[PDB]
Each structure stands twice: as C-alpha cells, then as structure tokens.
C-alpha cells in the first residue's frame, strides 16, 4: 500500500500505512518511490 490515513476499527484512531506508516513510526527515514504529493500527505511529512 502506498499510504492512506485510515480509521482503525478499534479505539477510532487515525493511522498511516505503507511508506507513511514506516516513516512516521521511525522504521524509515526517507522515501524514494513514486509518491504523489497532495494536501493530506504534506500535513504530516515534508516533500522535496
């Protein structure tokens, strides 16, 4: 999965998956992939 803010059914918490989940959780530090920039993704991470 590329990454999308999805509502987990339990406790109703927003969570990012894919590269977003890897990067935001500290498992990854930089994403070199065909990642499309948009308003939602720029709120939490920074794009060059």
């Amino acid at each position: 999965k590329f990454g999308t803010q999805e509502r987990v059914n339990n406790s109703n918490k927003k969570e990012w998956n894919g590269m977003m989940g890897e990067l935001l959780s500290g498992q990854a530090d930089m994403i070199v992939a065909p990642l499309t920039i948009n308003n939602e993704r720029a709120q939490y991470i920074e794009f060059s």
Partner: protein
C-alpha cells in the same frame, strides 16, 4: 454501469483525490468495492 467497471489501486493517492472531490463521490462508491491491491494486478486484469 455494471458492464463498464473502472478501478484503481486501493489506498493510494488517486483514491484520496477521488474521495475528497465533491462531484466525484458518485463514482467513488462504485470504485471502492473494485479497488485492487497493487498496480501490477490491475495491469494484468486490464490486459485480459
């Protein structure tokens, strides 16, 4: 329509873009059930 089915990769940038658009919601409810796991599977499906 049922005969014409168009889809995209589940949990990707285009899904977010279609979900946010105000006039584009009507097709989104149709495409959310037909989303594929990755681009390769969609390419294979459209090939055959």
């Amino acid at each position: 329509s049922d005969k014409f089915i168009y889809a995209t990769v589940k949990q990707s940038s285009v899904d977010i873009y279609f979900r946010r658009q105000v006039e584009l919601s009507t097709m989104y409810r149709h495409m959310e059930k037909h989303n594929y796991e990755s681009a390769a599977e969609a390419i294979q499906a459209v090939r055959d």
